[PDB]
């Protein structure tokens, strides 16, 4: 179920990440390779993840894309997606975010987990996910498709690492007992006006299923969540176009608020 030479899939990493890293977008990759698998766009995201640990980066969490179902029926697809987080993609609770850096940077508003306990996959659901959760954590993810095109595109999204590139944590980190997953509302704030407001049952019905979705992707290439992983689990909101000079602040009820300001 791949289609890419291992060259190819060497030689994509290195494109689309640098479309990150010089901060400029690119085609669509299955424009190039129309015949490019999931297994090929995987290959070519942990290539990336790879390159990234190379230089000393480290992984510091996962992120779920497409957890929509929705979404996922509108591409024509049977699963979320995932990406990884480098360190560099962490920004502080009312950190200041250079634009420079971005291509067409939106935000959303999620759910992040912590675990305590390891979670694998095939055949991971809710159930099996709860007792491994240590605590939940109000994330905002900056996502900046290095691609220029309108459409999204699954295959070419995972390859450019689930469009990752910025994520903001705060608010107060809860355990799964003082919070309702399903039921966690959010507002986004943008230039304090209002724009967005979303319920975490937005992400699959509850965002704990991303977790366990994650957990039987990540068994797909015979990976697994190992404890103490940070996952955002996905937006809750519609994304938001961020631009210099913004300001946004995400409240999570019973949770604070993220923050992040925009140069
Ligand atoms: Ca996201
Ligand atoms: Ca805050």
Same mark, same amino acid.
């Given at each position: 179920?791949?289609?890419?030479?291992?060259?190819?899939?060497?030689?994509?990493?290195?494109?689309?990440?640098?479309?990150?890293?010089?901060?400029?977008?690119?085609?669509?990759?299955?424009?190039?390779?129309?015949?490019?698998?999931?297994?090929?766009?995987?290959?070519?995201?942990?290539?990336?993840?790879?390159?990234?640990?190379?230089? #000393?980066?480290?992984?510091?969490?996962?992120?779920?894309?497409?957890?929509?179902?929705?979404?996922?029926?509108?591409?024509?697809?049977?699963?979320?997606?995932?990406?990884?987080?480098?360190?560099?993609?962490?920004?502080?609770?009312? #950190?200041?975010?250079?634009?420079?850096?971005?291509?067409?940077?939106?935000?959303?508003?999620?759910?992040?987990?912590?675990?305590?306990?390891?979670?694998?996959?095939?055949?991971?659901?809710?159930?099996?996910?709860?007792?491994?959760?240590?605590?939940?954590?109000?994330?905002?993810?900056?996502?900046?498709?290095?691609?220029?095109?309108?459409?999204?595109?699954?295959?070419?999204?995972?390859?450019?690492?689930?469009?990752?590139?910025?994520?903001?944590?705060?608010?107060?980190?809860?355990?799964?007992?003082?919070?309702?997953?399903?039921?966690?509302?959010?507002?986004?704030?943008?230039?304090?006006?209002?724009?967005?407001?979303?319920?975490?049952?937005?992400?699959?019905?509850?965002?704990?299923?991303?977790?366990?979705?994650?957990?039987?992707?990540?068994?797909?290439?015979?990976?697994?969540?190992?404890?103490?992983?940070?996952?955002?689990?996905?937006?809750?909101?519609?994304?938001?176009?961020?631009?210099?000079?913004?300001?946004?602040?995400?409240?999570?009820?019973?949770?604070?608020?993220?923050?992040?300001?925009?140069?």
């Amino acid at each position: 179920n791949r289609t890419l030479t291992r060259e190819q899939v060497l030689a994509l990493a290195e494109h689309i990440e640098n479309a990150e890293l010089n901060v400029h977008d690119i085609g669509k990759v299955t424009n190039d390779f129309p015949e490019m698998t999931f297994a090929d766009a995987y290959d070519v995201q942990w290539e990336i993840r790879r390159r990234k640990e190379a230089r #000393g980066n480290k992984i510091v969490g996962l992120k779920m894309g497409l957890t929509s179902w929705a979404k996922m029926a509108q591409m024509g697809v049977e699963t979320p997606i995932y990406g990884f987080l480098a360190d560099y993609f962490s920004v502080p609770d009312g #950190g200041v975010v250079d634009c420079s850096k971005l291509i067409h940077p939106k935000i959303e508003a999620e759910i992040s987990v912590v675990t305590k306990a390891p979670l694998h996959g095939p055949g991971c659901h809710l159930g099996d996910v709860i007792a491994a959760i240590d605590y939940v954590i109000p994330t905002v993810e900056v996502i900046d498709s290095r691609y220029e095109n309108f459409k999204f595109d699954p295959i070419s999204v995972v390859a450019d690492n689930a469009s990752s590139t910025r994520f903001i944590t705060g608010g107060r980190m809860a355990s799964l007992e003082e919070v309702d997953l399903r039921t966690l509302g959010v507002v986004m704030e943008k230039n304090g006006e209002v724009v967005e407001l979303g319920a975490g049952a937005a992400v699959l019905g509850h965002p704990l299923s991303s977790v366990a979705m994650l957990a039987n992707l990540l068994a797909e290439r015979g990976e697994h969540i190992p404890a103490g992983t940070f996952i955002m689990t996905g937006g809750i909101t519609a994304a938001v176009p961020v631009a210099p000079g913004d300001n946004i602040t995400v409240r999570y009820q019973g949770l604070g608020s993220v923050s992040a300001r925009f140069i």
